[PDB]
Amino acid sequence: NLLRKNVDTLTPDEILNLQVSLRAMQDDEGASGYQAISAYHGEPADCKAADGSTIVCCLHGMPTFPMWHRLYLVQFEQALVAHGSTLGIPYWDWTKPMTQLPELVQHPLFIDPTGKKAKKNVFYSGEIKFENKVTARAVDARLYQASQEGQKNFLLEGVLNALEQEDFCHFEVQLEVAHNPIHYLVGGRFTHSMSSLEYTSYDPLFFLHHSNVERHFALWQALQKHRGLPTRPNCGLNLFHSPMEPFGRDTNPFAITKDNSKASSLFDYEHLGYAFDDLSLNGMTIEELEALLKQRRSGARAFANFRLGGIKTSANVRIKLCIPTEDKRQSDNCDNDAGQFFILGGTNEMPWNFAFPYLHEITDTVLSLGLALDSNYYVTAEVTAINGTLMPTQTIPRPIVTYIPPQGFKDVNMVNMDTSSLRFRKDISSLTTEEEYELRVAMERFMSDKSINGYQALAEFHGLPAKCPRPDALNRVACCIHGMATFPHWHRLVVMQFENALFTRGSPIGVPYWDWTKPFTALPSLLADETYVDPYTKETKPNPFFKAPIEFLKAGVHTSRQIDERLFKQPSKGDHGFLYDGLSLAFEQDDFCDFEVQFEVTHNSIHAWTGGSEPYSMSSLHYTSFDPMFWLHHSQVDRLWAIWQALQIQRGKPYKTYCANSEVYRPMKPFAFKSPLNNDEKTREHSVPTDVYDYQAELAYTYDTLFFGGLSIRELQRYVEEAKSKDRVFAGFLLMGIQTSANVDLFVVAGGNEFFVGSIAVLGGSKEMTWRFDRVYKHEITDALGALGVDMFAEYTLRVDIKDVNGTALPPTAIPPPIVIFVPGIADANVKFDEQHRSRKNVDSMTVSEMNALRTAMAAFAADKEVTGYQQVAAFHGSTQWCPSPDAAQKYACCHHGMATFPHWHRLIALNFENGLRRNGWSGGLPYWDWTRPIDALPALVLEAEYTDANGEAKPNPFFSGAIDSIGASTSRAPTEALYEKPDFGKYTHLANEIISALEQEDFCDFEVQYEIAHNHIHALVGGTEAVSMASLEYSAFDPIFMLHHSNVDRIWATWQALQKFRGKAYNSANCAIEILRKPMSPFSLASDINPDAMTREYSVPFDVFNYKKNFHYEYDTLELNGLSIXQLSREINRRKAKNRVXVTFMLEGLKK
């Protein structure tokens, strides 16, 4: 152990030793010499990086800064000791308030106690041999403080704030930033001083300083040891596996550093042959320090968020805190300054950008001015070059305020239920042909023709007629928000504009969305078809969604989305789909901005993907909004946010943009404009996105489903926990906003060969608004590494190749090099309530994997012949003597009909089937199929006799008719009647009508008659000539289709209830036909022995089966009917009820036939 002590605590003998020894190495021309070694850091630039010209050898701004410099300390230290030097390089604690530079360097000509004479002095200055002469340091007044409170110790504040962060990445950015002030302040206006990274190493005070920053590093890693956090760098692993020059170079004097030139070996410093005396700043126990820090965390905080990079110079950035001006006059209170920091840099600097935002805490001064941390204010930056020259604000991306609420805090609630109408945005596939035609007409009229209130204006809002900040004057950019936390607010508003525009032109629907998350083979016919036929005129006219003119240019310019490439099925990636993967990762996060980066750049992919190389396509930020697809596209984008937001409310965590709070108060670019530039009241009202968060309250719309994948929001929650419990590794991109729009391809390179892990797109344009992300974009590289047979920490690099959408070559330098991130996962929740929840969807929307998973379970269900097993519950339709026993004689078939209690009993049946099916290997709820909607063929699940399993397979089926009774010992065959679709353009042929009629009446029984007799239709429709089918209820239940039927049947019974809730009448109870409503069911109530289900055992009485929500714990995909929402439904039945009509009545008695 070489010893590194405090500089002030040195003994005159220790000091004499240091002096004579550093003098000794000062007269060394050899590689152990001061010149040769100081030449490692700074000018002359001997290293070469990327494909660049000669560039400074030292490494700054990267995660490798601490390793490189701790190793530089080791090299200098051993080079010292090569001339004893009994001690290692001392640290001077500059978090300790200062009056002057350490006395060792205060004055040249140090006196020996044996004087004699003089001098030397080696600590005062080290000669910059080449390019003479030496350089003293012009100190700044800021270095010396603690005098009368303010200025508060900001050096200490820097290292203490860095010491607080629990990631290596964050710690690294805050540490390097906090280490820059000494360089700057000691260096000063002199070019050649510690102030520039060109020559900062030639000054002994540099080594005395980095001794201290190293002590900070060791202190941090030690504080990480206590108690359960990694001391490993989890950032930018690629730069770890290469020799950091000139330490790996063949002429390196000492073997200890050459054998340690790899940054990978420098995570711990025990093998380096040095040690500090104390490494605890300001007389603080590690327990005291961590107490102070973890209790500095608690409460509400506010930070100046800065996005830093190499500016080719050193600079002081002063932080001014601003209070916004209401009026035209620039009266913004920027008087009071909130903070300060420093940046080291130079010419021939290594190009660099922190992958994470630098945060400078301003909470205290924000508290000083008496304005809430939550409220609106902003932060501006005064950049003074080290030259003393005041610098343009453009030099550095503008500061932001980051707000940390008191955890945990629930943001304000949404407005209760629904009333009385909201615009419903559906899946494009969920649209009936009628709806397609009507929003086609709306779009047709809005687009054709042109006005200020017309399509082209709104298409112009987003990009390239460049009206931002104002259409005047000198320099104009696109208005849309990109590379910011406010992107989805902006585009949400935009989609609302589109919505109003289409509603006023006569469309019943909100703007539909298309799930690109669902794997799709081709574009939806809605936006794919060249033309379409008007049902009335039979005239073929343009599909308004295929193309759209670009008016403001005078030529034959139309939208050309012609090229869509790289997506459609393979390569990327895919667990399900590339988009699905990206968005999954997006939905994973708790914090807003973290989610937002993933959100946005995942969405960018579909832009570049569908746009292709076409200049007037979705590829270019300029013209992408002219393409109609946009509008539907971002409907979905909006919906995505919606889902995410819902997640948060289930997570119990805040859903508003607190990560970037100041930016929420900037008025949305083209929306806040007065009446000529924007004529939409609502959107202009929400030109401040603060009220934009509430889903349906302020903006008055909602979606049909919030389901992502096939997952419910809680099912999605379960998924993200499962994914979060695995050890993952990512490749992070700092997307900086290059002028054009581009595609980058990502490669993992092990030994001698590279692997394609994925591709991401950066959306932009020539006249784009300058944009830059605060955080880094993580792309899952884990499965790559898994398929590479290469471990997490094993040696591999990343390659990118960037090419513009137009197809020209882009230098790999255009975007900062991606970095590797390691994330270890863990969760205590669940424990959750996932066992007691179910979601019921269409079998027609199901995925093949879900299909197979469904089949298997049923095979297992049908295998068991008595008690548990499907045959028993289907035999609840099966007439064994359970009708009033033990004295039961001649009667009868036990199945609750009669008919008052039909809905109840069959609810219970479908529930028994469901639980019996989940018991045997399934995690989903019993699905259904919309027979209200017209049907060409049976659902894919039942139509074929044999199906192909994952590895191939003989017919089970088991969801085929072949399901046997074993009582009569034969298969329940299902035929088809020559049916069912004759619907003209309108309206609601067959079942739908009937069902709607049923929904009309207020009374339970009056509803139930129509309801059930409507339900009989299918029993008789899939029930063919063959009596073994569903046509007769002796054998009816045994065909698995039954389950689907009286799933959907039940759903109607649920929808009705919803209506009854909306209508202000009794829903989970009834006052008609009480006698049977009071009697427990025949098969469900018999015993614990007769049926498996415990809940159907407890809930036998019809009164209890009324409330399915709380009791049976299952919700449906939707309660829509033939595309109609419940509110819409009410409007429709009232509309029918308003007309004068005759009706015919039938008195029905039960006959066996």
Residue numbers in the entry: 1 to 411, 3726 to 4140, 7455 to 7781
From the paper:
Some animals such as molluscs and arthropods have blue blood because they utilize hemocyanin, a type-3 copper-containing protein that freely dissolves in hemolymph for oxygen transportation. Molluscan hemocyanins form decamers or multidecamers of 330–550 kDa subunits, which associate into huge cylindrical supermolecules with molecular masses varying from 3.5 to 13.5 MDa. Subunits of most molluscan hemocyanins consist of an N-terminal segment of six paralogous functional units (FUs; a-b-c-d-e-f) and a C-terminal segment with a varying number of FUs. Ten copies of the N-terminal segment (FUs a, b, c, d, e and f) thereby form a conserved cylinder wall, whereas the C-terminal segments form several inner-collar domains, located on the inner periphery of the cylinder.
Type 4 molluscan hemocyanin (squid type) is exceptional since this is the only molluscan hemocyanin type with an additional FU (FU-d*) within the N-terminal segment that usually forms the cylinder wall. Therefore, we constructed the entire structure model by rigid-body fitting. Our structure revealed a striking asymmetric inner-collar architecture and a conserved symmetric cylinder wall. 5 symmetry that is shifted towards one cylinder opening (northern hemisphere of the lumen). In TpH, the FU-gs form typical FU dimers, but in this case the dimers unusually occupy the northern and southern hemispheres of the inner space alternately [cyan FUs in Figs. 1(e) and 2(b)]. FU-d*s do not form dimers, instead single copies fill void spaces between the FU-g dimers. The segment of the wall FUs (a-b-c-d,e-f) is invariant for all ten protomers and there are two different possible conformations for each FU-g and FU-d* within a single protomer, thereby resulting in four different protomer types, namely conformers 1, 2, 3 and 4.
